Amino acid sequence: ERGNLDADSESFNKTIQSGDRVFLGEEISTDAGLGASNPLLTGTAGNSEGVSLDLSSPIPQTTENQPLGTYDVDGSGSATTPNVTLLAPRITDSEILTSSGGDVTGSAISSSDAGNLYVNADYNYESAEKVEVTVEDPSGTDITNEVLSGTDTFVDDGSIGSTSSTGGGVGIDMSDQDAGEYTIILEGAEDLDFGDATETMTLTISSQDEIGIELDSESVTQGTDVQYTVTNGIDGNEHVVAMDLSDLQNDATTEQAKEVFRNIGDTSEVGIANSSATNTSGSSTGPTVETADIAYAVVEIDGASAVGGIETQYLDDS
Amino acid sequence: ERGNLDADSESFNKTIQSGDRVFLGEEISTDAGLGASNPLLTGTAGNSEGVSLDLSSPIPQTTENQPLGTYDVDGSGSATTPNVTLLAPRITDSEILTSSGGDVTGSAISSSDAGNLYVNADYNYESAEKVEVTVEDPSGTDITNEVLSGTDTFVDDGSIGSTSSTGGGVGIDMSDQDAGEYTIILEGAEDLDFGDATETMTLTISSQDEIGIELDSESVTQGTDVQYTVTNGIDGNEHVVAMDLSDLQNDATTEQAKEVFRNIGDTSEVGIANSSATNTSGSSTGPTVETADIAYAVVEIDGASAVGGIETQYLDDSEVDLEVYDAGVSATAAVGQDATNDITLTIEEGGTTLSSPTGQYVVGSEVDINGTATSSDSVAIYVRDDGDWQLLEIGGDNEISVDSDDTFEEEDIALSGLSGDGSSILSLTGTYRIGVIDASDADVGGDGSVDDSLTTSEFTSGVSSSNSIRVTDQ
Ligand SMILES: *[C@@H]1O[C@H](CO)[C@@H](O)[C@H](O)[C@H]1O
Ligand SMILES: *[C@@H]1O[C@H](CO)[C@@H](O)[C@H](O)[C@H]1O
Fold first, then answer.
1. H or E, element range at B459
2. How many CA atoms lie less than 13 Å away from A83 in the CB half-sphere?
């Protein structure tokens, strides 16, 4: 069938019936259907008017010399006749989601947690051909057969956000492979693999996997703002950066201590916390500077890393 | 004739009759036909409407300033009148096939087998001009007349997949020429030789022609995956890469031997084969590891080369050879036959040492675990004092992963502080020994977890290392 490709377990179908849609890079079948009953057609209206489409030869790409439109054998017409509408190929969206959920595309993921990944996408060309997935190692070799987990290479239309194998999408168990940069390639099953019909999504595998913290500088004076970055963390989850109140200057006040952490970067909330109660940056309602014991700044992460900042002013020289 | 060019043995025809098709780069003939009876025409509908086409002058290329469409002398019209439809030139597909069949374009071919090659193509402009073939040497000279074999230069429409001279296509006997890179150029007979109407197909001639095998590295340790490439082979045929079972480690199991070859690259099937029977990777039905004698991995080739991979883990520390076999041989029947070619690599052992837990340790203090492991995945820490090596319960999974730099580290851990009977030994003041061991234990056979107290023989048998440590009171 065409339009319902999986009803017959066929990877591709190239028999076109009157009224359907045809894409730019297709290779119509001349054996049966509208490939031998009407080989050549002409434009009907608009820019397409007057131009000639030959079904037997591969339809040209580039959308130049073959303007998009509707084609009718007779010429400009409105009566029922063998006609077809040319449309461009496209894949609107693609993503790699962890089993829990959340995108990790273009970002390094721990080897331990990279064991139940999923790939989902939305594409325009579902009536003609499904879209293939090909995982490539940093060396440049097809590793699809090694990481596949019980599902055929074909991914269905829609099914974006599907965290389960029941919905369309392919499951990859990337735990066994070593550290490196891997590229997932999506392209049409047979012919629709040219520009705008293919996408290369990167993914980084690494095993240094403790939640990491780095500073642009280590030796600084008071008052110099320092930006700190958290690395190798789960996306969509909130970490906590702490500050020992012993390091604060003795002569600080309550309002003077709530400005140690800035709201810079991905930080959501800042404040000081006692063992049982907290005093956030919104209001001076919780514990006081002497009453509280820790200073915190809850920080999210977007991607593989998040950035915050500190103010070395009012800090002891140690 | 036009449309049936070979009915009159004419290479080209430039007399246009009413109703036909004309291409972009043509040069209409003004002597007769619709070249003197109606020299200029105008657009009829669409983008072409209003534009003027002059047949006498060469039709412009670039599809700009001369929009594609139908042209009529009167103007916009639907009545029968001298009219013509402009179309772009194109050649949809081209290939070079061996006499047996199979593409070899863009890939090196043996000089011996390059004696019955064929060139076939599919092009859009068949009514006006045929398409020429011109073979060029690496020096840049037309060698078409030397390699031609009994057929005119003109190749017909269709005839793609034609392995015989009866069908359209040109036969080339490229056996006599020397080694080099040759370019086959296809272009229209007279005028249609510009962009999109011409194609340059490369082809490499070489005489180093034994089936070749290469490795990205020769000196490696255990566990390091190695990618091997097969070179200079017939496309579309399945070779066989073999493995001598003598080189395998003695302590391997049946399931442990079926993972020596990966399914990476062009490999189709992997498995182990006895002289008469085979045990494929699909199921453990055929011979066992002791019963079987060879390990194979049937590999195809796409182009001139194919890539596979091996896993040096569970391999003896010695010279390792790779044997290839001729195309079409069966796995079972290849046990006795000599290998067409071979390649050898050397494998050496790797070291795994500790750095930070050495010399002194204050009892109850916390310290990080710092060290290196060249060929390791999971490592465990054991403590010995005048007897057994008691396992040290580091915590999560009792293992540490190793980075690419062959180095492993752990956060600050109090050895005596942690709960367990292992720490109780370190609680008391004295001199002890501490060592690291790879995941080869794996509960000395069983569940995938390091939970035992390996003795001296068990600890020493596997890859490991120990250093003297003493604990000082606070
Ligand atoms: C394409 O679809 C048509 C219509 O069902 C079918 O007849 C062909 O066999 C298939 O390839
Ligand atoms: C082109 O074709 C016409 C029509 O048969 C013929 O008259 C000319 O001699 C040839 O060149």
1. helix B456-461
2. 18
* Cβ(B1) – ligand 2 distance below 6 Å: yes
Q: Measure the CA angle with vertex A110, ends A165 and B464; round to 5°.
A: 120
Q: What technique solved it? A: cryo-EM
d(CA B334, CA B336): 6
Chain A residue closest to B43 (CA)?
A50
| SS3 category, B174 | coil
The ligand minimizing its distance to the Cα of A35 is 1
Contact A207 B124 (CB under 8 A): no
Breaks in chain B at C–N > 2.5 Å: after which residues? none
CA atoms of A43 and A67, how far apart (whole Å): 9
- A51–B63 CB contact, under 8 Å: no
User: CA-CA distances (angstroms) from residue B199 to B106, B122, B196, B413?
Assistant: 13, 12, 7, 68
Taken in order A63, A68, A72, A76, the sign of the CA dihedral is negative
Burial of B217 (0-12, 13-18, 19+ CB in 10 A): exposed
Q: Does any ligand 2 atom lie closer than 6 A to the CB of residue B2?
A: yes
List B21's β-bridge partners, or say none.
B85
User: How far off is chain B from A112, nearest CA to CA, in Å?
Assistant: 10
Q: In this structure, what token pair is assigned to residue B31?
A: 């002597």
Residue A160 Cα to ligand 1 middle (Å): 29
Q: Measured between alpha carbons, how far is A219 from B316 in angstroms, rounded to an integer?
A: 51
Which ligand 2 atom is nearest residue B32's CA? 7
Report the C-alpha gap between B240 and B68 in whole angstroms: 55
User: Per the structure block, which two tokens stand in for B9?
Assistant: 């043995």
The C-alpha torsion from B198 through B202 and B203 to B204, rounded to 10°, is 150
Nearest chain B residue to A45, by CA: B46
What letter represents residue B326's amino acid?
D
Read off the DSSP letter of residue B333.
G
With CA atoms as reference, report the closest residue to B305 among B261, B342, B265: B265
With 0-12 / 13-18 / 19 or more C-beta atoms within 10 angstroms meaning exposed / middle / buried, residue B270 is buried
Using an 8 Å Cβ cutoff, are B377 and B437 in contact? no
Residue with structure tokens 């195809």?
B300
CB B383 within 8 A of CB B425: yes
Q: Which amino acid is at A279?
A: N
Distance from the CA of B4 to the center of ligand 2, in angstroms? 11
Q: How far apart are the first and last CA of chain B?
A: 108
How far is ligand 2, taken at its centre, from the CA of residue B15, in Å? 6
Question: Cβ of A141 and B87 within 8 Å?
Answer: no
B379: alpha, beta or left? (left if phi > 0; alpha if psi -120 to 50): beta
Could you identify the atom of ligand 1 that is nearest to the CA of residue A13? 1
* Nearest C-alpha neighbor of B219 from the set B307, B305, B317: B317
**Token output for B116:** 């019955």
Q: Are B187 and B197 in contact (CB under 8 A)?
A: yes
The CA distance from B26 to B57, in Å, is 9
Q: Residue A19: phi, psi to the nearest 5? A: 100, -15
| Torsion on CA atoms B16, B17, B20, B22, rounded to nearest 10 | 20
Cβ A146 vs Cβ B312: under 8 Å? no
